[PDB]
Design a protein around this nucleic acid. Structure first.
Ligand code: ZN
Ligand code: ZN
Length: 45
DNA sequence: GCCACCGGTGGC
DNA sequence: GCCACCGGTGGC
């Protein structure tokens, strides 16, 4: 295996959740990070 | 065929 | 136990 976030992309440097995406609005049930914090390198295969 | 997203689970 | 990657696929 599993890749780790890069830690330096703009999403990785975000310090707070966007509060408006589907994953933010469903935080208590979602297994997914805020769409605005998802690492740009993890979006690539 | 695309892609948002469910949910199993690896890594800590 | 929590976080959130990632395989698979429902819904389009
Ligand atoms: Zn968000
Ligand atoms: Zn990153």
């Amino acid at each position: 295996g599993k890749r780790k976030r890069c830690g330096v992309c703009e999403p990785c440097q975000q310090k707070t959740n966007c509060g408006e995406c589907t994953y933010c609005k469903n935080r208590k049930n979602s297994h997914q990070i805020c769409k605005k914090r998802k690492c740009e390198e993890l979006k690539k295969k």
